[PDB]
Design a protein around this ligand. Sequence first.
Ligand SMILES: [K+]
Length: 344
Amino acid sequence: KTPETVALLQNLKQAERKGILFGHHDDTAYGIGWEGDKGRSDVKSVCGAYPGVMSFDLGEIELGGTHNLDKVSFAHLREYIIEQYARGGMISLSWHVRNPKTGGDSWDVTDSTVVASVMQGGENHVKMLEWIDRVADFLLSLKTKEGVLIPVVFRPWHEHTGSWFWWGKDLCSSEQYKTLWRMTNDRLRLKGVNNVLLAYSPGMESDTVEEYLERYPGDDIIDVLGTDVYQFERSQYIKQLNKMLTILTEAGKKHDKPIALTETGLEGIPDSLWWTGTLLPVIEKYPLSYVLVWRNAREKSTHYYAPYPGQVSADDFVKFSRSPKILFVGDNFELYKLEHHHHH
Ligand SMILES: [K+]
């Protein structure tokens, strides 16, 4: 891993001391009522600072086209990534990859033999490695104008304990799933992709650490232990989020990995006090390195997870943002600076 990448990991590992970076998907790409405006951010428009983490998706890079599945160009993603690094924030990338057997999208679960087909000897193995190489080439293009590779937390194969993606629980064995991870790591390493940290991120199906780790590909592959948990009903969310963050904290101590709430949110945040009244009291109890809420879909204006100006939860988001526990660009962290000393 590059020096800046090791520094990022070491700074994620001191979350207990520094606080929780706040994140938003596609934050500088678009939001409610806009797309592509230079420097614009629904998060910054509400609270005045950029989120400490921004994530974007590489889905459809494997098809060799110019835009991802959410119609954002890869050349724009690279710009947004360079700009987030320049201001000192973190970047994460997910990968809603197409179905290599059916030609469908990530959510095509018609065929439960897709992962088998990309194993060694399978009809789609070479193509799967070509697809991963296309991700590798994009990652290698994430450079500062001075030529420094930009560290990224790459989070492929997510939500694998559910069965809504073609790599999900009912669609492959535990060993097949771990092999996806090994193929991914192998190709990234061969390509010299030394600017990636890998994050593991199943949802809330697991009730225990044993279950959470059943499909874990190993400490030598994974750098960040995450989970994706959304609010559908408040009491259940509080129970299930506490349950998963307890699992993450226990597992992260057992395996010496930082932890993160890699996706969460309340769609349309109709609860005007969601941020301080529901989310913060849960997450502040756990040593999270970051918490990321999902995109503000310009193309479906009910589908948003961060506020925007005038949105009913916006004032409360401002109050949340002022918590010393929650970190935005401008706050007291330096992700890419090594402080050169062991933990004790
Ligand atoms: K803050």
